[PDB]
Design an enzyme around this catalytic site. Structure first.
Site, PDB file in Angstrom:
ATOM      1  N   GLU A 113      -3.619  -7.049  -7.113  1.00 51.22           N
ATOM      2  CA  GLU A 113      -2.752  -8.034  -7.703  1.00 51.22           C
ATOM      3  C   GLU A 113      -1.088  -7.528  -7.229  1.00 51.22           C
ATOM      4  O   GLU A 113      -0.133  -8.538  -7.199  1.00 51.22           O
ATOM      5  CB  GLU A 113      -2.749  -7.786  -9.318  1.00 51.22           C
ATOM      6  N   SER A 135       0.673  -1.285  -0.075  1.00 51.65           N
ATOM      7  CA  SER A 135       0.040   0.052  -0.074  1.00 51.65           C
ATOM      8  C   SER A 135       1.009   1.309   0.080  1.00 51.65           C
ATOM      9  O   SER A 135       0.259   2.246  -0.201  1.00 51.65           O
ATOM     10  CB  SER A 135      -1.033   0.065   1.233  1.00 51.65           C
TER      11      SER A 135
HETATM   12  C1  LIG Z   1      -3.316  -7.349   6.849  1.00 54.65           C
HETATM   13  N1  LIG Z   1      -3.287  -6.010   6.434  1.00 54.65           N
HETATM   14  C2  LIG Z   1      -2.847  -4.973   7.506  1.00 54.65           C
HETATM   15  O1  LIG Z   1      -2.420  -5.362   8.504  1.00 54.65           O
HETATM   16  C3  LIG Z   1      -3.047  -3.422   7.498  1.00 54.65           C
HETATM   17  C4  LIG Z   1      -3.266  -3.013   5.904  1.00 54.65           C
HETATM   18  C5  LIG Z   1      -3.314  -1.339   5.621  1.00 54.65           C
HETATM   19  P1  LIG Z   1      -1.549  -0.785   4.797  1.00 54.65           P
HETATM   20  O2  LIG Z   1      -0.365  -1.343   5.878  1.00 54.65           O
HETATM   21  O3  LIG Z   1      -1.450  -1.596   3.630  1.00 54.65           O
HETATM   22  O4  LIG Z   1      -1.559   0.528   4.578  1.00 54.65           O
HETATM   23  C6  LIG Z   1      -3.605  -4.086   4.920  1.00 54.65           C
HETATM   24  C7  LIG Z   1      -3.785  -3.713   3.548  1.00 54.65           C
HETATM   25  C8  LIG Z   1      -4.274  -4.646   2.496  1.00 54.65           C
HETATM   26  F1  LIG Z   1      -4.614  -4.154   1.281  1.00 54.65           F
HETATM   27  C9  LIG Z   1      -4.192  -5.913   2.730  1.00 54.65           C
HETATM   28  N2  LIG Z   1      -4.381  -6.942   1.691  1.00 54.65           N
HETATM   29  C10 LIG Z   1      -4.178  -8.455   1.953  1.00 54.65           C
HETATM   30  C11 LIG Z   1      -3.960  -9.118   0.726  1.00 54.65           C
HETATM   31  C12 LIG Z   1      -3.625  -8.197  -0.299  1.00 54.65           C
HETATM   32  C13 LIG Z   1      -3.373  -6.719   0.272  1.00 54.65           C
HETATM   33  C14 LIG Z   1      -3.745  -6.673   4.166  1.00 54.65           C
HETATM   34  C15 LIG Z   1      -3.497  -5.567   5.187  1.00 54.65           C
END
Ligand SMILES: Cn1c(=O)cc(CP(=O)(O)O)c2cc(F)c(N3CCCC3)cc21
EC number: 3.5.2.6
Length: 269
Positions: A145, A47
């Protein structure tokens, strides 16, 4: 230089305990002194691009005044997992600025994808970073992705050193106009997602803006921040992690500890 040498053992022990790779680049903007640990290795952005995405949106806004005010309409399809703000405004839509705030401060995935579209997609954000002299940064793909964090994949990566150098330019340098600069700093200052990362190592009487990234695989998570200690020059730093196995967990505590060691290595304590 000599400060990078001091922290080598502490960083080695921290990353050995973590069971992956920690990348750190920390700059004292007063002395120009720096702490580096795997600072030129690629780490997945996750992110963390959303911050540079917001600063690219702002940079564009310096050409087309009224861009930030522009309403954006979207459908259920835009709402990819973790769109906590945009899902509340589906039936109404939102403005560019609100999507930018959502993306930076709530890491909102729909908001990021909608803002990527407006700049020419990942190649468009990359184009912006090249224009501020960042030759390392690359965004290739969209939410979700871009989160694959595949070992050795250069897609959707940068280095801690490029992240810090580019952050300094956009927050403290001449990369943005002063209004857009202070707006960028203020979105970063208002971030809600970083309380357990670089902020956890920053005394309460020091100002800080940050953007987090969490990929959810390969122990891959990160944070970058500008930190304004009292009565000394701002510090700019990037802390990136990854790990060799897909099922490896990220650690916010490791990011916070790496930030402490970076600040300690600069002797700002
Ligand atoms: C597990 N997890 C977090 O703990 C924190 C966040 C917020 P940030 O630290 O990214 O700003 C997070 C964001 C995601 F898009 C995400 N997806 C998990 C599958 C693909 C992405 C998990 C997230």
């Amino acid at each position: 230089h000599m400060l990078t040498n001091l922290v080598a053992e502490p960083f080695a022990k921290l990353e050995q305990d973590f069971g992956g790779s920690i990348g750190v680049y920390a700059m004292d903007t007063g002395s120009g002194a720096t702490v580096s640990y795997r600072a030129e290795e690629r780490f997945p952005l996750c992110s963390s691009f959303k911050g540079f995405l917001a600063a690219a949106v702002l940079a564009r806004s310096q050409q087309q005044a009224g861009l930030l005010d522009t309403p954006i309409r979207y459908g259920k399809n835009a709402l990819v997992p973790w769109s906590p703000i945009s899902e509340k405004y589906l039936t109404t839509g939102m403005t560019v600025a609100e999507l930018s705030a959502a993306a930076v401060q709530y890491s909102d995935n729909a908001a990021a994808n909608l803002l990527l579209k407006e700049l020419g997609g990942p190649a468009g954000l990359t184009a912006f970073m090249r224009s501020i002299g960042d030759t390392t940064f690359r965004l290739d793909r969209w939410e979700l992705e871009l989160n694959s964090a595949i070992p050795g994949d250069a897609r959707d990566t940068s280095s801690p050193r490029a992240v810090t150098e580019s952050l300094q330019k956009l927050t403290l340098g001449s990369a943005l106009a002063a209004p857009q600069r202070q707006q960028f700093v203020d979105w970063l200052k208002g971030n809600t997602t970083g309380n357990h990362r670089i902020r956890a190592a920053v005394p309460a009487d020091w100002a800080v803006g940050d953007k987090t990234g969490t990929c959810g695989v390969y122990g891959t998570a990160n944070d970058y921040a500008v930190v304004w200690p009292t009565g000394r020059a701002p510090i700019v730093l990037a802390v990136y992690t990854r790990a060799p196995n897909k099922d490896d967990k990220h650690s916010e505590a490791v990011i916070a500890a790496a930030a402490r060691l970076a600040l300690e290595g600069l002797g700002v304590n």
